């Protein structure tokens, strides 16, 4: 018994061909079996054929004869029909209103998450849907990790390098950061984890949360995890105020934050707030200075990744007192600075997943890109707040999409807060890049920022771009472009102060060759995101629509504080980077 997903209307009926069972009313859950291929019903019970070896699940095959459900063959001589007068039958007939269309919960039920259109479609249904879409997108997501073959530990080889047996009849994950394992030791009647894991070609390459001495027979899973149902929405009813709501402003501030007093004004006179931060714009800052500026203030500090919470918690060290924080863990190695797991100190630090149920002055949501509506929902449903501020970029890296083949996710569509972001706006912007040399704020600026995108710094005249196709060759799932990497050692030798770049692709494979070839510190754009460094080696390796995404390559080029070589597939971006031009040797 629950709440119609599209018409809200009380039920005794969840449609058990979705993976998420939603509550369907009479009217909607009828719309919904007889206009696709769902025709398993649930209710108390769930509506089958309830005769001995009879495998009759369709509804509209079924009827209540005595207190049981039947199919044709099997019912009594007095029964009725589950699924007539344009409803199906249940608790709670009388009341339901239905829907004019249910076309779009029907494509949420049953579109399998590899198109774009299901991710524009699930970012632009009414709230409901929203959440439905969420959760069947995650349990889809969770589903297909189970479809991967066991890793087993065959040989070791060395230390950091193993030999990989895998399951029969099953495909492998890709072999990068994305997909982190679970190993497992072999025991007597069952199995116990021995921590979460990474894997690249090498034999493999194991990057390992924790050491050990791993041997033979030990094996890898990416650990799935129970999807829980959304009941809050991914954005709470917005509200305008006059004057600053239950907020005291400090009379005392530093010059450091005072660039940032307007901004937290506008914090206190609404009920959720966006800000967007370009790269090196302060975004942490911010996120702390409010504490400051409102020093009475219990402020929960959230995001999806604990490095995210972290570096929260590393700008909170600085400034805030440490006996009034606290990090939450469940129960990886994160921020260990502060009191752990007190949910009534002022200011909590806490990944989404992890959040307790509580209140708070202000939630301060950072790194938002990288949110889904999943996430979202579960913020509302566990944090009830006087402010939600939004921090983030829709113009850097959202959530990896594992399912996605079909077109590429526009940031309109990372998620609810990114949607009002690119369409009405965001309340507040950061304008000026301390970080980045001007050649790459000028970039970005245009590229991403609609201009708006301010430099701090002078051109360093350190920001050089090749035009250089070379040769691509893919291995199981990444890409490599030797020649790319030689035009690189070739420039090193001409230029060795370059010596202390980081080297950065969009590419696993790519970063693996470079590393041995260069003997440059590697950084796929997803993982450099965040990161910053004095020079940066960015070879595009091909012209995807992967190497080619704007928000990769607005991360990848707002790396550098000082210079940058770009060595380009893509005319297009090639023409769009403000850098010197150097020809070929
Ligand atoms: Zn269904
Ligand atoms: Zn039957
Ligand atoms: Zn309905």
């Known amino acids: 018994v629950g709440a119609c997903v599209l018409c809200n209307s009380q039920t005794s009926l969840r449609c058990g061909a979705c993976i998420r069972r939603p509550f369907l009313c009479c009217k909607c859950c009828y719309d919904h079996v007889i206009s696709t291929s769902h025709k398993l019903v649930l209710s108390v019970n769930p509506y089958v054929c309830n ?54 919960f029907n494509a949420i039920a049953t579109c399998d998450w590899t198109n774009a259109g299901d991710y524009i479609l699930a970012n632009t249904c009414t709230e409901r849907l929203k959440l439905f879409a969420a959760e069947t997108l995650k349990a889809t997501e969770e589903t297909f990790k189970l479809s991967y073959g066991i890793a087993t530990v065959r040989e070791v080889l060395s230390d950091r390098e193993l030999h990989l047996s895998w399951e029969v009849g099953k495909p492998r994950p890709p072999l990068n950061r994305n997909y982190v394992f679970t190993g497992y030791r072999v025991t007597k009647n069952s199995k116990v984890q021995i921590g979460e894991y990474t894997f690249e070609k090498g034999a ?21 995890h129970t999807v829980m149902p959304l009941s809050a929405p991914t ?63 219990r402020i929960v500090y959230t995001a999806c990744s604990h490095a995210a919470v972290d570096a929260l918690c590393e700008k909170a060290l600085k400034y805030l007192p440490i006996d009034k924080c606290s990090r939450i863990i469940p129960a990886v190695e994160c921020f260990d600075k502060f009191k752990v797991n007190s949910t009534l100190e002022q200011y909590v630090f806490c990944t989404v997943n992890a959040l307790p149920e509580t209140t708070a002055d202000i939630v301060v949501f950072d790194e938002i890109s990288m949110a889904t509506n999943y996430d979202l929902s579960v ?6 707040a006087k402010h939600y501020v939004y921090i983030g970029d829709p113009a850097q890296l959202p959530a990896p999409r594992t399912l996605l083949t079909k077109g590429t996710l526009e940031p309109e569509y990372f998620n609810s807060v990114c949607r009002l972001m690119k369409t009405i706006g965001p309340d507040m912007f950061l304008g000026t890049c301390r970080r ?13 920022y609609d ?68 003997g440059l510190p590697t950084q796929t754009v997803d ?47 090639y023409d769009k980077l403000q850098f010197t031009s150097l020809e070929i040797p």
């Open 379 to 384: 913020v509302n449903a566990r944090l009830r």
């Open 204 to 224: 493999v390459v194991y990057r390992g949360t924790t050491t050990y001495k791993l041997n033979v027979g030990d094996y890898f899973v990416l650990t799935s």
């Open 51 to 104: 005769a001995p070896g009879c495998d009759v699940t369709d509804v509209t095959q079924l009827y209540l004869g005595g207190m049981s459900y039947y199919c044709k063959s099997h019912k009594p001589p007095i029964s009725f029909p589950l699924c007539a007068n344009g409803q199906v039958f249940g608790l709670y007939k009388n009341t339901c209103v239905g829907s004019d269309n249910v076309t779009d």
């Open 451 to 518: 201009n708006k995108l301010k430099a701090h710094k002078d051109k360093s005249a350190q920001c050089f771009k090749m035009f250089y196709k070379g040769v691509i060759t893919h291995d199981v799932s990444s890409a490599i472009n030797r020649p790319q990497i030689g035009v690189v050692r070739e420039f090193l030798t001409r230029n060795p102060a370059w010596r202390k770049a980081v080297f950065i692709s969009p590419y696993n494979s790519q970063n693996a060759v470079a590393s041995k070839i260069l």
């Open 527 to 573: 993982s450099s995101q965040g990161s910053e460094y004095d020079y940066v080696i960015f070879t595009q390796t091909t012209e995807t629509a992967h190497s080619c995404n704007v928000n990769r390559f607005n991360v990848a080029i707002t790396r550098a504080k000082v210079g940058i070589l770009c060595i380009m597939s893509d005319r297009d971006l």
């Open 235 to 297: 954005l709470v009813p917005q509200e305008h105020y006059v004057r600053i709501t239950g907020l005291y402003p400090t009379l005392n501030i530093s010059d450091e934050f005072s660039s940032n007093v307007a901004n937290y004004q506008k914090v206190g006179m609404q009920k959720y707030s966006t800000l967007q931060g370009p790269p090196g714009t302060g975004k942490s800052h911010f996120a702390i200075g409010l504490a400051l500026y409102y020093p009475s203030a």
């Open 436 to 448: 980045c040399p001007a050649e790459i704020v000028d970039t970005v600026s245009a590229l991403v």
